[PDB]
Amino acid sequence: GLSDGEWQQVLNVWGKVEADIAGHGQEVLIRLFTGHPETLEKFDKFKHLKTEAEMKASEDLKKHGTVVLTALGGILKKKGHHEAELKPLAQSHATKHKIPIKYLEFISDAIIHVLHSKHPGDFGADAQGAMTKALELFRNDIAAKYKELGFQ
Ligand code: HEM
């Protein structure tokens, strides 16, 4: 649950992402894959990537980064009223991709890391607080659907 002022911070930060969605999406996935190499094994189309240089050179990884952040941005713009947008993603990630909630924690922290890396000194403590709360809400509502499905 976020206040109006917190949502305003989230959507202000998101403007930074929308200026370069592919570059942000690429770096988020690279941070996930290099920090948590077990996550790469869930992607049949990226498991061939052995080095970060190959990851950086992969145009399909940048494409998928655009898909991921476009979906997340659509959810964030609903300011919590995201049941219709979130349900299909919860279902596909639990039942088809088999993504444990832990990996959603990993990618949430990766987003925070990338924002500081690309905007050092321009991602203030209030903005980090609000973005963190928004990603916690996203993860918590996914977790509720995971529990319904019995997925661990
Ligand atoms: C912010 C969190 C995430 C968002 C918004 C997101 C979004 C998406 C979307 C929109 C798709 C394509 C449609 C679909 O299959 O539902 C997708 C596919 C997929 N996601 Fe995610 N995802 C997220 C996190 C993760 C994480 C953490 C993992 C694994 C560590 C993951 C694994 C996958 C896989 C394996 C696919 C299929 C890729 C393919 O072969 O095309 N997702 N995701």
Swiss-Prot record:
Q: Which InterPro entries match?
A: Globin (IPR000971), Globin-like_sf (IPR009050), Myoglobin (IPR002335)
One GO CC annotation = sarcoplasm
The record's subunit annotation is: Monomeric.
The residues listed in the UniProt record as binding O2, with positions renumbered to this chain, are H64
Tell me which species this is from: Equus caballus (Horse)
Taxonomy of origin reads: Eukaryota, Metazoa, Chordata, Craniata, Vertebrata
Taxonomic superkingdom: Eukaryota
Q: Which residues bind heme b?
A: H93
Question: In which compartments does the protein localize?
Answer: Cytoplasm, Sarcoplasm
Q: What is this protein called?
A: Myoglobin
Residues where nitrite binds:
H64
